Scaffold this active site. Structure first.
Site, PDB file in Angstrom:
ATOM      1  N   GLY A  97     -12.166  -8.157   3.821  1.00  0.00           N
ATOM      2  CA  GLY A  97     -11.672  -6.701   3.951  1.00  0.00           C
ATOM      3  C   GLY A  97     -11.344  -6.633   5.520  1.00  0.00           C
ATOM      4  O   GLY A  97     -10.737  -5.815   6.053  1.00  0.00           O
ATOM      5  N   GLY A  99      -9.558  -8.647   7.404  1.00  0.00           N
ATOM      6  CA  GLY A  99      -8.526  -9.275   7.825  1.00  0.00           C
ATOM      7  C   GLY A  99      -8.119 -10.491   7.773  1.00  0.00           C
ATOM      8  O   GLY A  99      -6.924 -10.989   8.233  1.00  0.00           O
ATOM      9  N   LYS A 100      -8.900 -11.585   7.110  1.00  0.00           N
ATOM     10  CA  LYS A 100      -8.679 -13.010   6.911  1.00  0.00           C
ATOM     11  C   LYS A 100      -7.256 -13.453   6.402  1.00  0.00           C
ATOM     12  O   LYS A 100      -6.824 -14.361   6.868  1.00  0.00           O
ATOM     13  CB  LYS A 100      -9.670 -13.729   6.218  1.00  0.00           C
ATOM     14  N   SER A 101      -6.540 -12.738   5.409  1.00  0.00           N
ATOM     15  CA  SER A 101      -5.367 -13.304   4.967  1.00  0.00           C
ATOM     16  C   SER A 101      -4.365 -12.807   5.854  1.00  0.00           C
ATOM     17  O   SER A 101      -3.621 -13.619   6.026  1.00  0.00           O
ATOM     18  CB  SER A 101      -5.116 -12.815   3.649  1.00  0.00           C
ATOM     19  N   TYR A 102      -4.333 -11.544   5.912  1.00  0.00           N
ATOM     20  CA  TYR A 102      -3.230 -10.958   6.949  1.00  0.00           C
ATOM     21  C   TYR A 102      -2.909 -11.862   8.068  1.00  0.00           C
ATOM     22  O   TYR A 102      -1.980 -11.947   8.451  1.00  0.00           O
ATOM     23  CB  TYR A 102      -3.801  -9.383   7.234  1.00  0.00           C
ATOM     24  N   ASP A 245      -8.713 -20.245   3.969  1.00  0.00           N
ATOM     25  CA  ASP A 245      -8.603 -18.802   3.876  1.00  0.00           C
ATOM     26  C   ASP A 245      -9.933 -18.843   3.085  1.00  0.00           C
ATOM     27  O   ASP A 245     -10.136 -18.543   1.939  1.00  0.00           O
ATOM     28  CB  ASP A 245      -7.636 -18.137   3.095  1.00  0.00           C
ATOM     29  N   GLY A 248     -15.054 -14.420   1.500  1.00  0.00           N
ATOM     30  CA  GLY A 248     -15.688 -13.520   2.561  1.00  0.00           C
ATOM     31  C   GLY A 248     -17.119 -14.267   2.801  1.00  0.00           C
ATOM     32  O   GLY A 248     -17.424 -15.034   2.050  1.00  0.00           O
TER      33      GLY A 248
HETATM   34  N1  LIG Z   1      -4.478  -7.108  12.012  1.00  0.00           N
HETATM   35  C1  LIG Z   1      -4.008  -6.250  11.040  1.00  0.00           C
HETATM   36  N2  LIG Z   1      -3.058  -5.235  11.243  1.00  0.00           N
HETATM   37  C2  LIG Z   1      -2.877  -4.465  10.194  1.00  0.00           C
HETATM   38  N3  LIG Z   1      -3.359  -4.312   8.906  1.00  0.00           N
HETATM   39  C3  LIG Z   1      -4.484  -5.367   8.890  1.00  0.00           C
HETATM   40  C4  LIG Z   1      -4.752  -6.173   9.671  1.00  0.00           C
HETATM   41  N4  LIG Z   1      -5.840  -7.016   9.220  1.00  0.00           N
HETATM   42  C5  LIG Z   1      -6.139  -6.351   8.249  1.00  0.00           C
HETATM   43  N5  LIG Z   1      -5.533  -5.468   7.763  1.00  0.00           N
HETATM   44  C6  LIG Z   1      -5.402  -4.607   6.294  1.00  0.00           C
HETATM   45  O1  LIG Z   1      -6.288  -4.830   5.573  1.00  0.00           O
HETATM   46  C7  LIG Z   1      -6.067  -5.122   4.256  1.00  0.00           C
HETATM   47  C8  LIG Z   1      -6.811  -6.417   3.851  1.00  0.00           C
HETATM   48  O2  LIG Z   1      -6.675  -7.468   4.795  1.00  0.00           O
HETATM   49  P1  LIG Z   1      -6.975  -8.631   4.216  1.00  0.00           P
HETATM   50  O3  LIG Z   1      -5.962  -9.759   4.968  1.00  0.00           O
HETATM   51  O4  LIG Z   1      -6.931  -8.792   2.916  1.00  0.00           O
HETATM   52  O5  LIG Z   1      -8.432  -9.273   4.919  1.00  0.00           O
HETATM   53  P2  LIG Z   1      -9.544 -10.257   4.210  1.00  0.00           P
HETATM   54  O6  LIG Z   1      -9.381 -11.580   5.009  1.00  0.00           O
HETATM   55  O7  LIG Z   1     -10.797  -9.440   4.426  1.00  0.00           O
HETATM   56  O8  LIG Z   1      -9.337 -10.694   2.782  1.00  0.00           O
HETATM   57  C9  LIG Z   1      -4.458  -5.536   4.102  1.00  0.00           C
HETATM   58  O9  LIG Z   1      -3.861  -4.993   3.019  1.00  0.00           O
HETATM   59  C10 LIG Z   1      -4.154  -5.097   5.503  1.00  0.00           C
HETATM   60  O10 LIG Z   1      -3.000  -3.875   5.472  1.00  0.00           O
HETATM   61 MG   LIG Z   2      -7.295 -12.311   1.721  1.00  0.00          MG
END
Ligand SMILES: Nc1ncnc2c1ncn2[C@@H]1O[C@H](COP(=O)(O)OP(=O)(O)O)[C@@H](O)[C@H]1O
Ligand SMILES: [Mg+2]
Length: 323
Positions: A97, A99-102, A245, A248
Site C-alpha cells: 500500500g 507504492g511499490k507497483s506504482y 516487485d 509486502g
Molecule cells: N507516488 C505516488 N503518487 C500517487 N499515488 C501513489 C503513489 N504511490 C502509491 N500511490 C497510490 O497508492 C495505490 C497503491 O500503490 P501501489 O503501487 O499498489 O503500492 P504497493 O507497492 O503497496 O502495492 C495506487 O492505487 C496509487 O494511486
Molecule cells: Mg503493487
C-alpha cells in the site's frame, strides 16, 4: 559497485484519510525523517540515502517527485549500465500500500507509467535511433510471479504447474520451461506486460486485486551484436535486467524474510542464497556481478510508524551492500 537506495513517500490513501492520519514523514535533500506518534516528545529518527523522493502531494507542487524524476534518476542510469554490458536490477520493497507497483508499473493512463514501462520505452528508443549498421540488437523478456516458493510464468497462462527453479552445474540458476519472448518494438513489449499484470494471482482479502504476497520479476535479456568490418565475427554483448516487485513486508513469505538476511549479511560483509528462491534466482543481480538499486516506498500515515520505520531500516542497510 555499491547498491543505490531511494525511498519514496506517497500521498495519503483511502485507509489513511478515514483514520484522519497525520503525516509523520518529512524530506529534505537526501534525508528522510520519521516521527513517532506514540512518543511525540523525543527526537525523530533521520535517514540519508541516495534519494529521498517526496511525492506526498501532487504533480502541481514544485517539489513533487514524479515518475519522470524517479526513472531518470535510477532507471536511465541502470538501463545505461545495461548498455555498457552490465547485468542490472531494480526492486521495490516495502509495506503493501506504500507504492511499490506504482513506482514500477504505475497507471499507463497519462504519464503515470513507472520504472518498468519507462525503461523499456527508453531501450527500444535507444536501439532505434541507432542508425549505425554494425550494430544489431535483440531483446527477450520474461515476467514471473514467485508466491510460496512457487514460480509462475505470467506470460504462458496455459501452464498451471509451478515452474521448477534449477541450478545449472555450469551456468547457475534458471526457471525451467519459462517463457522467453523476443520483442521488436515497445508496442509489442508493452502488451505482454499488460497481460502478465492481469494473469497475476487474483487472490482475495486484497479486494480481488493482484494479491501481493508474491514477487513480480520482470527480466529483460538485452543482446548487443557488433560487427567487425573485416573478420566476419560478431562481438556479442549480453546483459540481464531484472525489475522485481516484492510482496509486502509487514512483520511468512520466506523469500522476503530471507532477502532481509542476505541484505543484512551483505551489509555486514557465504549467504543463505539457496535458503530462498527469490535470492537464488537473483544470485548475481542481488550480490553477484551487477549494479543493483532498491526503491523503498513509504506510507506517510502515522498509523504505519512501525512499518514505515522498519522499511527505512531495511532500506538503510541496503545502502551499504557493495557488489
Ligand atoms: N507516488 C505516488 N503518487 C500517487 N499515488 C501513489 C503513489 N504511490 C502509491 N500511490 C497510490 O497508492 C495505490 C497503491 O500503490 P501501489 O503501487 O499498489 O503500492 P504497493 O507497492 O503497496 O502495492 C495506487 O492505487 C496509487 O494511486
Ligand atoms: Mg503493487
Amino acid at each position: 559497485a555499491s547498491v543505490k537506495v531511494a525511498v519514496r513517500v506517497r500521498p495519503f490513501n483511502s485507509r489513511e484519510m478515514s483514520r484522519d492520519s497525520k503525516c509523520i514523514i518529512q524530506m529534505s535533500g537526501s534525508t528522510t525523517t520519521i516521527v513517532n506518534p506514540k512518543q511525540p516528545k523525543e527526537t525523530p529518527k533521520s535517514f540519508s540515502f541516495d534519494y529521498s523522493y517526496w511525492s506526498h502531494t501532487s504533480p502541481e507542487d514544485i517539489n513533487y517527485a514524479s515518475q519522470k524524476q524517479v526513472y531518470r534518476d535510477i532507471g536511465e542510469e541502470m538501463l545505461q549500465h545495461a548498455f555498457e554490458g552490465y547485468n542490472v536490477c531494480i526492486f521495490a520493497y516495502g509495506q503493501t500500500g506504500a507504492g511499490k507497483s506504482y513506482t514500477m508499473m504505475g497507471k499507463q493512463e497519462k504519464d503515470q507509467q513507472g520504472i518498468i514501462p519507462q525503461l523499456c520505452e527508453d531501450l527500444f528508443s535507444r536501439i532505434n535511433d541507432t542508425t549505425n549498421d554494425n550494430m544489431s540488437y535483440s531483446v527477450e523478456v520474461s515476467y514471473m510471479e514467485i508466491y510460496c516458493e512457487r514460480v509462475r510464468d505470467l506470460l504462458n497462462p496455459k501452464n498451471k504447474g509451478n515452474l521448477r527453479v534449477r541450478e545449472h552445474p555450469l551456468l547457475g540458476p534458471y526457471v525451467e520451461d519459462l517463457s522467453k519472448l523476443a520483442v521488436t518494438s515497445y508496442n509489442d513489449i508493452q502488451d505482454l506486460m499488460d497481460s502478465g499484470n492481469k494473469p497475476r494471482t487474483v487472490a482475495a482479502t486484497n479486494m480481488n486485486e493482484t494479491s501481493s504476497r508474491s514477487h513480480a520479476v520482470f527480466n529483460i535479456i538485452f543482446t548487443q551484436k557488433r560487427h567487425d568490418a573485416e573478420t566476419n565475427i560478431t562481438t556479442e554483448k549480453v546483459s540481464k535486467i531484472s525489475l522485481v516487485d516484492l510482496a509486502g513486508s509487514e512483520r511468512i513469505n520466506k523469500s522476503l524474510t530471507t532477502l532481509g538476511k542476505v541484505i543484512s549479511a551483505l551489509a555486514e560483509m557465504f549467504i543463505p542464497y539457496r535458503d530462498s528462491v527469490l535470492t537464488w534466482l537473483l544470485r548475481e543481480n542481488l550480490g553477484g556481478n551487477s549494479r543493483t538499486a532498491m526503491v523503498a516506498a513509504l506510507s506517510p500515515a502515522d498509523i504505519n510508524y512501525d512499518e514505515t520505520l522498519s522499511t527505512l531500516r531495511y532500506a538503510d542497510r541496503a545502502k551499504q551492500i557493495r557488489n
